[PDB]
């Protein structure tokens, strides 16, 4: 037996505590380097000039930030979409002044999550399962990729990506609503419906399954102790739960097939997240949401306002105040 | 700058429940070991 054969046998072995596989060869190093750089930068990084106007912003704990306000600042606006590795800087200090770590972290991290999806499929194949969990995982990956990579590509600069911090996301959301009028895009509505319905269905399923438990403990023992690893008991004494759901609402609406129920559970939030990620990706190219400003007028011709006009006033207030020193001309193209 | 009482609040409110839970787990394990006859009583 050759050395390469033994190596291949070890890599694709199912006996390891954590599966490695061949997607692991890409997943592990990238995720580890991203984690190390992120921790070091979040703790002890110097201020970064994000807007390209020589006005650095502090984001590390050692420079006067707490957990809520700390972040890793995106790269400088002067760089744009240009590749900025470490070896392309005159010194490490210049690399840190221009927001170098952001590109490294985001790139190695995106490669890591793609390899994570691949590894999920690979273990499913090795175990004899059906290969569709990673399809479900593809939605959060799509959303994260959408923001971090697709928005800078469309807007033409890495400095418009979402900061790696807690209040950075709030800044990102507020500016995005001001400039693109999200909350009127139907894809965002689809995403909101997806998350709300997912929570609703999760609560309903949990309540229905837990209520229909058969009595095997009596009083002085947690009800969770009645189940044994390997016990055969379908996940709901039907008469009880089926009658309860048929009586609670219109009787003809009741999922009596487990396969369809669990398929619907998987389908709803995944589709919602797919639609909202595509909405973000499309708005990255300036195809904004619905515009109904000054749409109702009287007979004479005067304008009668609606709630959309109040939303517009809030948007104007957000718009005139963001990046105060960065603009020189009337239009924010 | 920051409030001084926050040090005491954070450290005490973090340390006390941790030790409480650890005590619960350790006494449970000790009772389990005692019930089953062995070298450790």
């Amino acid at each position: 037996v050759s050395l390469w054969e033994r190596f291949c046998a070890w890599i694709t072995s199912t006996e390891n505590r954590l599966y490695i596989g061949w997607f692991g060869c890409l997943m592990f190093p990238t995720l580890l380097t991203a984690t190390s750089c992120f921790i070091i930068a979040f703790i002890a990084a110097p201020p970064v000039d994000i807007d390209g106007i020589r006005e650095p912003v502090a984001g590390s704990l050692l420079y006067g930030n707490n957990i809520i306000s700390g972040a890793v600042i995106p790269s400088s606006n002067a760089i744009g979409m240009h590749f900025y590795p470490i070896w392309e800087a005159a010194s490490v200090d210049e690399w840190l002044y221009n927001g170098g770590p952001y590109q490294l972290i985001v790139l190695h991290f995106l490669l890591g999550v793609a390899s994570y999806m691949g590894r999920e499929w690979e273990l499913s194949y090795r175990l004899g399962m059906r290969p569709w969990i990673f399809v479900a995982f593809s939605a959060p990956v799509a959303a994260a990729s959408a923001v971090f990579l697709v928005y800078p590509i469309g807007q033409g600069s890495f400095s418009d990506g979402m900061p790696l911090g807690i209040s950075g996301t709030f800044n990102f959301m507020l500016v995005f609503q001001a400039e693109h009028n999200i909350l009127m895009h139907p894809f965002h509505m689809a995403g909101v419906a997806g998350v709300f319905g997912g929570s609703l269905f999760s609560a309903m399923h949990g309540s229905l399954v837990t209520s229909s438990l058969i009595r095997e403990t009596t009083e002085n023992e947690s009800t969770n102790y009645g189940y044994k690893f390997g016990q055969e008991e379908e996940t709901y004494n039907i008469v009880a739960a089926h009658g309860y759901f048929g009586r609670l609402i219109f009787q003809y609406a009741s999922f009596n097939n487990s396969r369809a129920l669990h398929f619907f559970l998987a389908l709803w939030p995944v589709l919602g997240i797919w639609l909202t990620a595509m909405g973000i990706s499309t708005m990255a190219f300036n195809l904004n949401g619905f515009n109904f400003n000054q749409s109702v007028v009287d007979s004479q011709g005067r304008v009668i306002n609606t709630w959309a006009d109040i939303i517009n006033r809030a948007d104007l207030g957000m718009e005139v105040m963001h990046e105060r020193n960065a603009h020189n001309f009337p239009l924010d193209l | 700058e920051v409030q001084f009482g926050a040090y005491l609040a954070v450290l005490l409110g973090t340390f006390l429940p941790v030790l409480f839970l650890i005590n619960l787990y350790i006494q449970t394990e000790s009772r389990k070991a005692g019930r089953d006859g062995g070298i450790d009583s």
Binding site: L62, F229 | A6, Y7, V10, L11, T14
Partner: peptide, 28 residues
């Protein structure tokens, strides 16, 4: 001086996660 507190809390959480993953009760 509160940066010490923040760092201690984060590292403690990471230690808890490590112990949860690698020193775990056997499912059997």
């Amino acid at each position: 001086m509160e940066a010490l507190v923040y760092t201690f809390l984060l590292i403690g959480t990471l230690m808890v996660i490590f112990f949860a993953v690698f020193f775990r009760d056997t499912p059997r």
